[PDB]
Structures are given as C-alpha cells and as structure tokens.
Amino acid sequence: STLKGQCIAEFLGTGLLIFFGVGCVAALKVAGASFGQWEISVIWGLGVAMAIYLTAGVSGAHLNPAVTIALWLFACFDKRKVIPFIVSQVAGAFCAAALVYGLYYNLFFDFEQTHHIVRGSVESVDLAGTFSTYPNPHINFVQAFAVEMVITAILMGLILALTDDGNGVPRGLAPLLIGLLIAVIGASMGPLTGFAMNPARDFGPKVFAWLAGWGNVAFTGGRDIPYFLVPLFGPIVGAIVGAFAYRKLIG
Amino acid sequence: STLKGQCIAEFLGTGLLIFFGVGCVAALKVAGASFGQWEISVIWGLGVAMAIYLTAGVSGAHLNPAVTIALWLFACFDKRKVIPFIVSQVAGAFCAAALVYGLYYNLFFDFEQTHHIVRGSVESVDLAGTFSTYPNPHINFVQAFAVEMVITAILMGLILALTDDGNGVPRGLAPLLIGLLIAVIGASMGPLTGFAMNPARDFGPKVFAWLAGWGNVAFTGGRDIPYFLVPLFGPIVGAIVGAFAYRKLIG
Amino acid sequence: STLKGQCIAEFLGTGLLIFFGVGCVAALKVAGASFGQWEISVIWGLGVAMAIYLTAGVSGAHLNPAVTIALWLFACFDKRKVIPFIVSQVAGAFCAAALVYGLYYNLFFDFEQTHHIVRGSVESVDLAGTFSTYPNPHINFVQAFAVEMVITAILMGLILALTDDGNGVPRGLAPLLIGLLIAVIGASMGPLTGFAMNPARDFGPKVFAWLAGWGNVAFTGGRDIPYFLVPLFGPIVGAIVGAFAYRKLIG
Amino acid sequence: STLKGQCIAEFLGTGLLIFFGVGCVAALKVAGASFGQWEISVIWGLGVAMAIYLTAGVSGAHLNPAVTIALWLFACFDKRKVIPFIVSQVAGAFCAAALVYGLYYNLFFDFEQTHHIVRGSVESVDLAGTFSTYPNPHINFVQAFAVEMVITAILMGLILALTDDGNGVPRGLAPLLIGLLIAVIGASMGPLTGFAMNPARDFGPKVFAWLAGWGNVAFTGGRDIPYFLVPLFGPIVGAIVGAFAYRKLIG
Fold first, then answer.
1. How many domains does chain A fold into?
2. Closest CA to B68 of B20, B23, B14, B29
3. Residue span of the structural domain in which C63 resides
4. A47/B184 Cβ within 8 A
5. B203 is in an annotated binding site
6. Chain A residue whose CA is closest to D39
7. Where residue D21 sits, what CATH number does that domain have?
8. What is C230-241 written as a DSSP string?
C-alpha cells in the first residue's frame, strides 16, 4: 500500500469512530435518548473496534496521533509517515463531526431554542461537549492532565500487549479486545475528563465547533487556562509513558 | 443448495431477525419493559448475528435486499437469484411481524383501550412504530434519506471488510462482529430514522401494519410525502455507495 | 465418562445456570438492585454459557430436558441416558434454588414484612416469580403455550446450527453464542412468559417454592388452569418442532 | 521470567483491575454517573480480563491470593513463589486505590461537604465502600462468609475449566470468558457482599481507606465482628473447595 492509500484509510478510520462516538453523544444530548455512562463508553469502544477492522489491513489502524508517535518512537514506525498519518487523523475527525452535525442539524437548533442557549457563551459549552471533551467542574488543568496521561498509558500498554506475536491473542480478536478496553476506561474515568485518549478525536471536532459558531469557548471551555492543551499533549505524554513501561516491565 | 433451499433460508433468516427486533420493541411499548437506546440496538444487532449463523451455510445470509443488490453489482452475485432472494426476504419480514403481533395480541389492544388510541389515526403512528421505522419529528424526507444512505453505506463497507479472505477475521466471528456494528449504528443514529438499513425489515412489517388496521398512515407515517420511500430506496442507494467506496479506497 | 459422571455434570451444570439466573432476579426483587429487561436476560444467557463451558466435555452440556428429548429423537442420543439426564437436571435446578434462597434468606423475610405479604396467597405469586416463571396477566394458557413453543423451537434450531461441523463456528465460541441467543430471546419475549425454555429451570424451583411455604399457588400461579404445565410440556413440543424444522429446511 | 519479573506483573495486573473497578464505583458514588448492578459488574469483569491479557505471558495472571493458594495446593504451583505473589497482589491493589483516590480527590471532598459526612464515622462507611466491599445490612458475618465461599468456589472451578487443554476453549478467549463469569457473579450475588472473591482486592484498598482517614471503621465496617475477615479468609476457603470439587467431579 502506498502512502496515499494509507492516509485515506487513516482518514476513514478516524472518521468512522468519531461518527459513532459523537452520534451517540448527540442522541443523548439533543435527541432525548436514554444513555448511561457504561452505554456511552461501550459505543465509543465498539466504534473503535469497527474502525480498526476496516482499516487494519491497509495502514495498521493507528487512528490516534498519540499511538502513531509512540509506535514511531518504540516500534520502529516510519518517521516519513508520522506527519501525513497525523494530518489524516485530524482531518477525518473534523469531517465526521461535520457529518454528524448535518444529520442532527434540526435537533441542535430545536434544543437551543427550547433552552434559550446562545451559541458561543459559557452556558453553550455543554452543547459543545457533544463534539469534544471538557473537564469535570471540580478538577483543574493539572488534575485533568494527570487523568489523560494515566488512561492513555494504559491504552498504549494494552495495545502493545494485544498486538504482539506469542501472547496467544488472535489477530482477528485483538480489535474487539481493544474496544472493550476503551469501554472500561471510559466507564471508570470518563466522568473526569471525557476519556479523550486521542488528540485527533478532540482537536478535530473542536475546530469544527469553533467554526460552527461556538467561537473561543470551544477551545478554552470557559476556563482561564485553555483546556484544549490537555487532550492535545496529555495523550501524547501518556502514550510514550505506557509504551516505555511495557517494554521495561512486560515486553 | 438449490434455489428453493436458499429462498427458504432467506425467508427464515429475515424472519428470525424481525422476530427478535420487533419483539423487543413491542415489549418496550406495550409490555412495560424498560429498554434504553443501546439495549434496543444491541438486541437488533445480536438478532441479526443469530440469523446469519443459522442461514450462512445455505444462502450466504444476505437477509437484506440492499445487500443482495450490492453483492450482485459488485461481488458477482448471480442475477437470476436477485428477485427470488428479495421476495423471500420481504415475505419473511411480513410473516415474522404477524407472529410477533399474535403473541403480543392481548397487550396491543389493552394498550389501545388504556390510552384511547384509535387504530388508523395519526396518534396511532407511534404504536405502528413497533413494526416499522418512522422519522424523528424534527427531520424531513430529505434529511431522513441522507441518514439512511450514510448508515447503510457504513454497513455495506464493513460487511465487505469483515467477509474477505486475508483480513484476519475468522469466518465464525464475522457474524457476531456484523451484529455489533448494527448495534452501534442504531445507538448513534437510531433516534433519527430508526436505523432501518434494510428494505425488507421496513416494507414487510409496514404491509402487515396496513393490513392489521392502521391503514394508509402505516405507509405515509402522518407526512405529506410518504415516508415509506426512505427505508425502501435509501438503503439501496447507500449500499451501492458503500460497496463502491470500499472497492476504491480499501479493497 | 460413565453414566454417574455425566449425571453429576448435568446436576452441576443446571444448578450453575439456575444459581446465576435466580440470583439476579432475587437481587432485583428483594435486594433493590436496578435491572432492566435486557440486563436480566443477558445474565441468564451468560450464566448458561458458563454452565456449558464447565460441563460440555463430560456430558455434552444438555442442561435442558427439552434439548435432551430432542437430541434423543433427532441426534441419536442414547435412550438409556434420557431418564437419568432429566432427573439430574431437575435435581440441580431444585438444589440451586434452595441455595439462592438460603443466601437471600434475610432479605426475603424483610421484603415480606415491609409489604405485608403472606406467603401462600395470590399476592405472594410475584415473590414466587423469583424462582420460576409466571405468565403475563393479559395472556392465558393457550397464548402462553404458543410463546413457549416458538421460543424453544428457535433455541433448538440454533443449537443444532451452532454445534454442527462444517458451519464454521469454533467449538470454543459456540457456548458463548448460545448464551447470547438466550439473551435476545428473553429480551424480546421475556415479558410474556418469562422465557423458561427449560422444563427443569421451571419445575425444579417450583417444587422448592411449594416446599418453601408458597403452597399450591406456586404451581397454579393464581390461575384456574395450573400454569406449571406450560413450561413443562411447552418447551418439549417446541424443541421437537425446532429440531424437525432444522433438519428439513437447513440441515 | 525471573521471580522479580513475575512479581512486577502481578503488581501491575492486580493494580489494573483495581483501577478500573474502583474507578467505576467512584464515578457512581461521587461523580454522579448512572450505573446499574449489571453495568458495575461488567466493568469489574472486563477490567479483570484486560489485566489477565496484559500479564498472562509473564506470571500466569493469578491476580488473586485465593487463586494463588489454590493453584499451589492443586495445580503444583511453586511454593517459593506463593508469598511474593501474594505480597505483590496486595501491594498493587493498595497503590491502585491511592491512584484512583488522587484522580477523584476533589470530588470526594465535595461529596463529603455537600452531605455533611465526617470521615471515620459510621455514616462514612458508604463512602468507604468505594474502595472495599461491605456486607448488606440484613446479612451478618456467617451469611457473608457463606456467600464469599460459594462465589469463589464457582470462580475457581470455572478458571480450571477454562484453562485446561482439551476443553476446546482457545487460550486467547479464556481471559475474556473469565471476565464474563465475574460479571454474572457480581450481577447475581453482588448486592449481598460486594462479590470481593479476592483477598487482595479487598484488603489492599481497605488499608488505604484506613490511612486516608476512615480509621477503624474501614476494617470493621460498623459491625461488632470485624467484617474484613470475610473477604480475607472467605475466598481462600472457597477457592480450595472449588478446586477440590472440580478435580473430583469434572476434572
């Protein structure tokens, strides 16, 4: 597979997981669907598994800039493909957020008119939480960064544990096992930071929310310190830590 | 296997998935069962997986006219079997809707008498939603068609991705993975159009609802433009788009 | 394996599935646990899968008199083992119901004193529904028998479909797939008759409920026609129909 | 693998399952997350499966002192590694409880101030139930011990049933099947004693709760007889019984 073919697969794979994840959150927020914390988390994980199954044979199904950087540093992934892979991942998440917004277009405006929410204000951040993740009100930037580092380290460590020959896990079952890992992470740590674990999953839809009319509050989240840095660099630091720990303690 | 044997398998396979899907919706609506959006979606998906496991060895387990048309256009499926397969699929969905109605017969009339609902009126469309799918009140024909096209394209693309040699997915695990894909599609996009994704799944029970006493509102759904066209031609267009995209970008 | 060894495995396997199924129903009824229809059904199915995994290698993991009779009539199962297998299955369900009652002993009496329920009365049938299945108030004996026949036919047909060489289903994955089939059956048809599908699962705990103090209402269920016949002979008729249909239409 | 390498794997594996299990309970209690009994149980089980997948190749993934003792007595596990394995398991559960407390630090104090709960009192035992298990108010020490013995015997018996060559279960699917077994055990027996089934899972976080400020009530649980003995010796007795029963009746 050429570089162009793998970039398209990364674009489609990241878009597919964003389409399922944002869609279910949109259904809970503006469509009146009844979802619990476990149900939302299991939709995110299974959507990732389907995205991996679709694009594993072409590009390896990274679908995460943090995973792409960690693989380059620790799994001898080609450095020439690092930038195009990351660009394709963010582009796929951005376009998928636009597609979900288009399908839920009439419900978003009906929700705003009913609750008298003006887009771009602090009170509109909750609606902006459909696309991207925002921290719990009781935690700050430092605690939010620690949560993102820890959960991404677990994800990176288990990905290496589930995708190494000799561990007994079939290659056909590994994508499903990865999705279940994301579900329990989101179920146990989601109410804190939104279990982003993916710079593309957060930055992409955040750019669309800024263009959709939410303005600066899409990036800052109503906080003095702009929150968008936590899902951007937090997973990157955590992925490196998780990959380093696995090679030292398990691998 | 002869053509008659495959048609019977398609009749039973489509009926089995309708029996599980309509039954769970009936339990939520007239039996007082507590179901969320994810729970309803996961029953639909797992019911499809069981139907595929039962009939895969005989007819290939299409169980969807949109999939049958897409396979004929892109997977060299025999054209002589296209019409009998589609006829058997719609017949199976029709008979299964009648069977579910017979088992839930006393609960349907008790529900109508309690809520003073006259069958065949606009207020009875919600009860008619047990058998077939109807759009969200905030979306119209054009947006409903777009939703059905997109979700069927994802289903068709993943079906080809999950049923090709060399992708590493075992043949015994593919039917279960297909069902999980339907669950997340229904969880993320269900509150919009009912995630029909299957012309037989919608048209079949719709004909029974018309015969059961709902009349013309079973097809139109209380809309000026008859809604039944969206689940009829929407999945067909989406399946072709999804199959074409997979061959160009992934396959 | 000798006959004594297989009878012990059938005794333990049926007891294990009753222990999980009755325990979760007891938690919902007297322990205040929050369970939906899907959640209860998925506990029953997964408990059956664990029971099959434990006893498949010894006795074949029938754990159902209806399945045992159907296998003898259609799968050349030994007739000399039919009676001891059925006796062991009912004995295992009876003892497991007693064990669950012992663990939940203090909660059952606290529930009765709080709600002023006298054991053995018509108002105590709901508490007796913890151990065995009772019909929906809007359905009668004839409709209850039809529901039990249909769902057991689907279970028997899929069991043959999931346990035949050449269908591509691994032997290690078949028990889990069987449990998921039970979950969707209970989710879609449970609110009607309790998805017994197993004469031992119902008759066994019913005998214990009669001995525990519920008296005659444990068998009759407060109905003029004794309801206990429906889960006794209903699954037996359905299992034969399902096995016959599979051999004629699929097998 | 040397003894030091296996001890680290046991430390990380037990910590990983505690991180997921305590985190989801913390989200339900202090973060306002909506969780049912099945949802909490399925997070515990799947977290165990991920922990097994990470550490099976190094130390065998015991992650339970009761399992370690049972394997030494019945599976010829090395006696020299029994003490270091148990020490590592309790250490991992202790550190993971501290990590979860640190991430949820601000939410715990906000919950206490809102409800006017003084740490170390009887009314604070419910908050202490986030880390460790405490019995249902209607059951006493004797019934709590019986529940822990029975459920651990089932877990030990199924673990031997799922990890023996010749049973047809793939080695890659066994960890997932073990997690599903824990989910149904917690769903059916959790509202009684908290389905500890693991001396490290309970004693470890209990020591942290005592150090975190809960004092003596973390061990006694507000009972005249200290409850901490039930999850300590209960699973050990049950694991031996379950292993002995499997070798006599199934193995």
1. 1
2. B14
3. 3-249
4. yes
5. no
6. A38
7. 1.20.1080.10
8. HHHHHHHHHHHH
